[PDB]
């Protein structure tokens, strides 16, 4: 089915994700409701849910949402249309964390305003979100941040420790964004870049334009090898760009791979001009749509007769007791998840092998 493509339509309606500037009025929201109806009719909703979660994370972590009330009501609309409760709970937790992060940033700006840090207190924003819902990966990659940001992370860590002692903050450099100022001769144009792109651009800043090799860049940025190449793809193969900021590639080739020992160098007189006419006060966004962050059928047959065995052993049981006995029995086999047990639960009740008690919503009766 369409799945992800349909999710793209949502990205074109709920917020200005990229080319979604075509917004007319609130009636489009009604059209979104129709899309929700499609989500009811179609199958394979896991991909759609994952795409929607990724789009929401990309929109919220960048503050590019066209509307706020529509985004808040989208959770209720999705819950009404029918979706797993885990996704709804994760969305609610993400929204609550985003709400709390505004107050945290305001408190940080209001309190730390005498140390002067490095940049002005009105130019640094801190957004701390819970890692149990807003993230899934747990891998840390060095970025070798510049000296300007080397005095801001410790201050944020100290403030978080003072206010909410008991939790550890693990900074995620992939989702961070910022604006840098260039001085490429004719026109000084602001550029929006992530942490890795900022490090790559600032590596060739301690000695004018000059020229550096791939090995030197890798040894300076200290990035995770192959991922560094991906960052280069953002600075050498920017789509719909008249002239890239880092207009170099040595032996041509392609930004995908085969970098080898290419000598990339920044173009001092690069023609990075908005509308190709006088880049006096231009601004270029280079982040783009990055948003960086036992076969099943033979295995599902294992647990159903296990549930039926638990039921045939004892007629009366509760939900918690059923879960405890099921996980007690199935330890020798694979470790059960939560989604599989739930799926088996309504597969059993839909086959009317068990009866849901009317007085008690959790009590089950064998047949």
């Amino acid at each position: 089915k369409c799945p992800e493509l349909l999710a793209n339509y949502c990205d074109m309606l709920l917020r200005k994700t990229p080319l979604s500037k075509k917004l007319t009025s609130e009636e489009i929201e009604a059209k979104l409701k129709e899309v929700l109806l499609v989500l009811k009719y179609v199958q394979n909703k896991d991909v759609f849910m994952r795409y929607h979660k990724a789009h929401l994370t990309r929109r919220l972590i960048l503050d590019i949402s066209a509307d706020s009330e529509i985004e808040e009501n989208m959770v209720e609309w999705l819950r009404e249309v029918g979706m797993p409760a885990d996704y709804v709970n994760k969305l609610a937790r993400m929204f609550q964390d985003i709400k709390v992060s505004e107050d945290l940033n305001q408190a940080f700006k209001e309190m730390h305003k005498n140390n002067k840090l490095a940049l002005p207190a009105d130019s640094v924003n801190i957004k701390i979100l819970n890692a149990g819902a807003w993230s899934r990966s747990s891998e840390k990659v060095f970025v070798s941040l510049p000296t300007e940001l080397e005095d801001l992370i410790p201050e944020v860590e100290e403030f978080y420790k003072k206010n909410h002692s008991g939790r550890k903050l693990h900074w995620h450099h992939l989702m961070s964004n910022g604006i840098i100022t260039f001085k490429n001769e004719v026109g000084q144009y602001d550029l929006e870049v992530t942490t890795f792109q900022l490090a790559v651009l600032f590596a060739w800043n301690q000695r004018p334009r000059e020229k550096i090799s791939f090995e030197n860049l890798k040894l300076a940025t200290e990035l995770p090898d192959a991922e560094l190449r991906r960052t280069l793809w953002s600075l050498v193969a920017f789509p719909k760009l008249k002239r890239q900021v880092l207009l170099y590639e040595p032996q041509v080739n392609s930004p995908k791979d085969f970098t080898e020992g290419t000598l990339f160098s920044v173009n001092q007189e690069f023609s990075l001009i908005k509308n190709a006419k006088v880049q006096k006060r231009g601004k270029i966004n280079l982040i783009g749509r990055l948003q960086l962050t036992g076969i099943v059928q033979l295995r599902i047959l294992r647990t159903q007769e296990a549930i039926i065995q638990i039921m045939k052993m004892r007629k009366k049981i509760s939900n918690a007791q059923l879960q405890t006995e099921l996980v007690e029995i199935l330890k020798n086999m694979f470790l059960p998840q939560k989604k599989m047990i739930k799926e088996q639960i309504e597969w059993l009740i839909e086959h009317k092998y068990i009866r849901r008690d009317e007085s008690d919503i959790n009590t089950f009766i064998y047949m």
């Binding site: 007629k315 009766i365 064998y366 047949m367």
Partner: protein, 135 residues
């Protein structure tokens, strides 16, 4: 026939259960299950031939120590109390009916009394044999 091997092994008594069922249509306790109306229970009894009886008695004869050291009626006290309680219920039912079951109640009471007097007789015989020697 339905039996429970694990409970039979653990407890020590067999779990023989003989069941017939009421046919469909005739409509006229959680242990029995949820279809207690559809199926019912039956009593169980056993038999053995004269040759089987002789062979079983002669084989069980190599149990003399337990035979004269069992001292029954001290191990089956719960069974006898339950039997007396069921006797009281059956007697009440028979009295209500009189206002037959009386014969069944009499037979059950006779069985329990015979068992009790058999236990007393074995105890008396053991006392006569063991405790009345060498002053």
């Amino acid at each position: 026939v339905v039996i429970d091997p694990t409970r039979t092994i653990s407890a020590g008594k067999v779990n023989l259960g003989a069941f017939r069922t009421y046919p469909k249509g005739y409509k006229p306790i959680e242990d029995f299950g949820v279809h207690c109306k559809q199926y019912y229970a039956l009593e169980v009894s056993y038999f053995k031939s004269s040759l089987d009886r002789k062979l079983l008695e002669l084989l069980w004869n190599k149990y003399w120590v337990n035979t004269l050291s069992s001292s029954s009626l001290l191990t089956n006290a719960d069974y006898t109390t339950g039997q007396v309680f069921d006797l009281s219920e059956k007697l009440e039912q028979s009295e209500a009916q009189l206002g037959d079951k009386l014969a069944k109640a009499t037979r059950d009471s006779c069985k329990t009394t015979i068992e009790a007097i058999h236990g007393l007789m074995s105890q008396v015989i053991k006392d006569k044999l063991f405790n009345q020697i060498n002053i």
